Amino acid sequence: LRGAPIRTNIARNLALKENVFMMVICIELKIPLFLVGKPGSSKSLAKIIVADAMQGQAAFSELFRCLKQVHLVSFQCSPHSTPQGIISTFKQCARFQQGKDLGQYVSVVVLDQVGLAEDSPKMPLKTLHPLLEDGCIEDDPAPYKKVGFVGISNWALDPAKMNRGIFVSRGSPNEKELIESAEGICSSDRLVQDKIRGYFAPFAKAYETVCQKQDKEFFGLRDYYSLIKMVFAKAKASKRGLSPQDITHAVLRNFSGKDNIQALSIFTASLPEARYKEEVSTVELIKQNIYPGPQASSRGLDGAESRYLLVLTRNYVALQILQQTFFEGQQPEIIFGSSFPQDQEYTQICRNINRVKICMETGKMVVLLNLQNLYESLYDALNQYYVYLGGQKYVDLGLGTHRVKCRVHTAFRLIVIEEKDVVYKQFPVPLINRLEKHYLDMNTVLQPWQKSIVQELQQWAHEFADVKADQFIARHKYSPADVFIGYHSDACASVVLQAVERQGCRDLTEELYRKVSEEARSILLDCATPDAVVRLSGSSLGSFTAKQLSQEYYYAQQHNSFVDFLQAHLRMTHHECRAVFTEITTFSRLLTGNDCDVLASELRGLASKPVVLSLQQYDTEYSFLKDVRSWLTNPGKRKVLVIQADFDDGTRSAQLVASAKYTAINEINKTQGTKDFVFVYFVTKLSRMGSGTSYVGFHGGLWRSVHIDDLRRSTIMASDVTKLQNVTISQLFKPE
Amino acid sequence: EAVSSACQSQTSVLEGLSCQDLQKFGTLLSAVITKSWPVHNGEPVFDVDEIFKYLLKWPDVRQLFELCGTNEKIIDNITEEGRQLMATAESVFQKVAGELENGTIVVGQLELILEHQSQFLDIWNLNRRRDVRSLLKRRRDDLLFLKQEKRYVESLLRQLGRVKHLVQVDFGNIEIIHSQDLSNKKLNEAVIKLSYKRETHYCLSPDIREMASKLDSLKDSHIFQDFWQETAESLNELKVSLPEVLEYLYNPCYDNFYTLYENLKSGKITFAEVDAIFKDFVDKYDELKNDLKFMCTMNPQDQKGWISERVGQIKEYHTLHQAVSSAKVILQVRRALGVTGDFSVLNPLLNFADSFEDFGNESPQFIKAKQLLQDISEPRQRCLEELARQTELVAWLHKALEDINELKVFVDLASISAGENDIDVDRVACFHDAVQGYASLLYKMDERTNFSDFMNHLQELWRALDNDQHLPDKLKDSARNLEWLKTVKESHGSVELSSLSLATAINSRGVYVIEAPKDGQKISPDTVLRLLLPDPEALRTYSTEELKELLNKLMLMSGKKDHNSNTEVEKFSEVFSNMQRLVHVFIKLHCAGNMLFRTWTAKVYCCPDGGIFMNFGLELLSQLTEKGDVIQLLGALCRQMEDFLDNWKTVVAQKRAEHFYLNFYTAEQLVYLSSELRKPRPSEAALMMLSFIKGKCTVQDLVQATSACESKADRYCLREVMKKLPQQLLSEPSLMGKLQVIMMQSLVYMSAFLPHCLDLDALGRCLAHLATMGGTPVERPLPKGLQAGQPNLILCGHSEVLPAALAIYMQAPRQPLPTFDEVLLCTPATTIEEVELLLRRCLTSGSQGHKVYSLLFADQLSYEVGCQAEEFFQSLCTRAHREDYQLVILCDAAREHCYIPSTFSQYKVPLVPQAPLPNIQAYLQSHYQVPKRLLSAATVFRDGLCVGIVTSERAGVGKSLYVNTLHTKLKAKLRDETVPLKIIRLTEPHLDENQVLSALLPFLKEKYQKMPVIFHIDISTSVQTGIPIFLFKLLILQYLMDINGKIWRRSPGHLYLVEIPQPLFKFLDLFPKVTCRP
């Protein structure tokens, strides 16, 4: 271990020394190694340190100078692995050691997840047995063919077949092992380690209790190491020791998400002095994870950093809150498996990976959506280990049988948004431990009094459709869906989120409660069909509230025509946001091409020739991308783009909106300059035959939803139906 | 409602109200006390703590109680339930409040009252009218002593556990007393008088408590933990108790700490401890200030002139030592740099480095010596260390580069030579910045310059180091690349273009080609697209996987931050995606069965203005080509291709709905049949597969069917289309119109495009004609208790389903046995098309016979296949059918939970028909009898049955010997027999029929092997899950399947034999069996 190059904040546990020892001896004797162990067993770190420690002649130590040079050839082992991949890796190292010094240069293979493809459907690890004896198969054994092998696995491995190697089957890290690793990780600074040495043993005891508590392997060693590094960094930055809030924050951050685990209670029981009696919520934990400090990552190298975050949710709600009250200043890119018709998955994941790489190099946050298709191309970047060079971090990103190092900026954060069920039953535990878990589904952000706002608004909008009238001889009960188009028994939560975000101040003064309730009412009625707002005179609300809400619906809010809405929108400024994104739901027919021409005709002052986009033709994502690129490229200011989406038709353009929306915003975030405003409007045509109730709710966050009855202006009828309520048909024909 | 809203938030509702109206104020108080209650999903408490917490935290309950107790004319009229609740609240308060006069109070409620002192004092003064001060102060003092001793225990436990690796100490009873939570009665603390208070922490003696007090006084003192650890090493395993640790381990530590104390107090310390115990305070003193202040905490003595001058000595010694280190490293880099020069002030410095001194005072003569090296840096000498140990690097630079100007071109020579990867392209820049920074001492250095110039150069290097603190690491990782730095200047022709350069090349002159290769290999998407990159005249071909990994490589290029590179790479990626997608739609069409794209081929010129070049494998239609940008042309071509695919699936569904017999074969068998039937002398594969409709089809009957199917009216129509089409092609200027019209005419009139095949209409007519010549149609009535107009669902049982079906079909004695039609033996992952074909065969009007159509093992179909099958069945019953069909579905009795058994619950016949085993046996054995005058291989068998299953309880008996002796008995008669004996050893588990089919293929596709061939299948004992389906498919149904290829038909005259060793036991008895014994 001492001969190997040093690394600060590395623990001298029996684990790490044992793996690097067995590794250096086996690849010297060319003996297969089958290092297994639970996540956090330092097998991969052992592989990296062995690779960078056994260079032949330029070795830092004289003992590694007298030893051979090693050139491994990595090969990630996804469960969808083929024996051709390992055969190719073996042939590659056979060429590598061909013609070089056998006694000073040796090339080996590493299958970082070999245990994963033990039950792959394509029988991948079934020709490895002859391979690890005579170098290659279906050919003569020969020199420059014998190759080492380190079958690293994070899962229990079949011993019968792989007996020919050396099974270093790491056991469960014992309490003494955990305290030793605890001492070794904080070795970077001698001074604070002697201040924080006491907490180490109870930490290990509590960690073993929690790991043996749940049968599921939801928590592991990586979380413990992150916890100890986090407390190390907090103490060293604070320089005065530890306050209990820091310890509880650390354990909460690195231990959370699991439903049946009060890990805070478990840790604080063994640490009665480290109690906290105040409430700390998930929102500030996310804010700390995603926004590290200016004093953070400000000294030499990056040894102490947070993990990438994995929010656990349900009903795909995380994005709304995250885009409401966290993603401030700079909006992170959103990556997803685009749902546009006839897009090949391989090209899409390649493009997503390229965008990920661009974001990492630049240093702009990434928010993922699908991991069950790009987990094998990220866990190395989610390993958070860096191959330093020139003082710059570099990580491994892999595409198929091709792994390549790539730059990572020092200001870069990653968020994976997944639901509770999918992670708890489909997510691999190594990914779980590589990712800092956190649950923020729908209620965590929501204060209890905000839940009361939700229920009061629920009962307020449940009787908004409750109208009993004999103006017609008919009995048809109105659902709250039809009065407020989109409402889906959940839109109250999203709308109150929007309301509190709009208020911003976010305190309790008994005035903010009233005003957030009233703004929530305004946002509800802003998506209300005009017929409902005029029936509201006789509905169970009353007949003064009816007048007031009709006034707000026809005077303050703009709902006559799309063009009037655009004028009112572009006239006013915003919350310093370079762009404002609005969703429009309509019953009239979608614009047909001369309408946008006249639309610009009375928008000759502000708009920049808005372009309409039909979503039935974009049988590829890149058609939409190139259209958006062209619209951003054309000169002007305060440009406007409109996307039509007829939900009532034979087409499938119903869920595709989702993909399109992200794409558009993504394009702006990566294709808009720094000197032009942008307004994106998404328009959809709905019917009154029930398709106006089966439409999803108020997609919150970065979409201001609103409802326009008819897009086209009306010169014939007046633009204010309250006067038409006042007057009769006779009064419409009076002479001057 | 409004007060419920207001108290739902944490605001105050009533604070200064002038509300002398008594009844109405009582009503609003009832509202607040029924709506400010701690609701927890609907009146759950069953406890008193939460009520007390709400009592002590709410700013309106104390005002409410005040107002209700001021006058007696308000409480009387509030509400029955509200008065009940406030009576409960007052009772709860009285219960928790009579408790504080005693020790029965709980600690949690006690801290709760201490954190709401004002609320609690007001409510207690309120309840007094129906001591407070002294009782509460005494109680809080008792709590303070409680927490003091608890923290003493905590710190002692933590310190004794920090050395837990050396020694174990049993903590009397505290190890369990301290373990439990703080939810116990205060009376357990036993605050006694006559004074001392012995609590639940049974401290052995107050000496342990005062030791704990001192230890907590130096719990954080780093020096104290070092002393305690080194004195704990003196014991070493040992299970030792608390009382003897005080003098075994604590007393020596405290004594050493006390003596070292008076040693620093005297200022007589020596340098040995200075560099022995103060070695971790390098360049950090403020926390050392506080640590040394913690040092003076233990002794109740002042600190006025003790830490300041002593920490000054510490910092001056540290500065001295770092100055020695800097001086030695600067001399080292000097002597390695080759400069003689002169400093003439560091010789006394190194002489002192070779000196040893013992005193803790101020070196006074060394002030001037260290003046030149006071504040160089604590960092930044590592850069010079690296410079010193990298002699090879600087020697190579001064043997290769030697100047600053040519570097500007040198890195350029590197940039082309460097690889495409991010590491490869960043190597050049890191080396460039390293040499740019280090030219301060590497280029401005003469063999003789004085001290002042050296220091000025060091200063300008310092100001070159302020913006990039990684410069030494850049030097390190550039020096580690010395071989590349050597080979870049002597670079030969690097023959590897790039990932991005080859992107530009393939974009410049790429030729994508789709061929549907005429060679024998499959039609997989990998082998249907190739790429041509021409040049000279060399032309490199590219496969799909090579292109995909190319996409990976150029997708992981570094950051060039230019429009050209990213635009061209994404253009190449986009054209590749569209090309793959056209391949996707084309292969979907090919697997649908087209005959128009079998000889299709397409060249796509990735070059700008390169267009497309279509081609069809017929002489009567000329080539089709376009021009223009490739991306929107390809988008249009793909849209049109998908629309044509939809129209083609529609037209094949419609045409299959008209001819029944053309619903027999799968789509690829349709294309093969259409190809083959035009041959004058068709091969034996299609003859065999026609023997499943006509039966024993021959050339004469097939030519009769293909000659009496067409009329000269069809020929006139084809001549009309031929004379009409080319001007229609020339009518539309661009290719899109002529493409649309050629594909439309293909849909309407196909057979003229390829006068070497048959369209769907001609095929259906031919099959119908073969049906007409092949008479004696097959009739099969239903069993008793089975309805004849609706699905007949049966849930038999996994070991009875197959005999159930074989008994259902028994009710037609002397009727020809069923074949792959009307009897579908389902397996997991069965193609949907086969069940669609079965449903069609059972619901078409043209059948010239009533037959029972059975779907065995229905639950074994997958979920999605079952869903599609049920959707198709409902649709086909919706459009039209014949309402006399016999449909039987069989499922497994224990597998009712799957899709198709669950969806036929209403259509259930809970009858489960079956027949006695001898009846099924007689049925099968009699129906296997080969009639005389056929010259069959069954003549040697037990009088002509052509099927035998050979089994035995244990192996090694001679079953194979029986097979071979039967073969040689046949050889004995009918001399010159040359009878083949095929052997197939089905051996893998999860048995596959395709292997045995393929092994059987080359044997009757020749017609010169029509002679009796005694086949002999054999099996291995690792086939556990695949015996019955295959046995019944081959021996009973007489067919062998493949989703996309020819069909093998068991024939009446080729003897078959299946060995099987010893669930299945009942099954083997069905067939005419032979068994052997030791």
Ligand SMILES: Nc1ncnc2c1ncn2[C@@H]1O[C@H](COP(=O)(O)OP(=O)(O)OP(=O)(O)O)[C@@H](O)[C@H]1O
């Ligand atoms: N000895 C150690 N001391 C401190 N931290 C360690 C030690 N070994 C590993 N770690 C931590 O573990 C992480 C690296 O783990 P690593 O990738 O090597 O996992 P592994 O147990 O080898 O398994 P896998 O094969 O899944 O990668 C880092 O976050 C690092 O801080």
Ligand SMILES: [Mg+2]
């Ligand atoms: Mg045998």
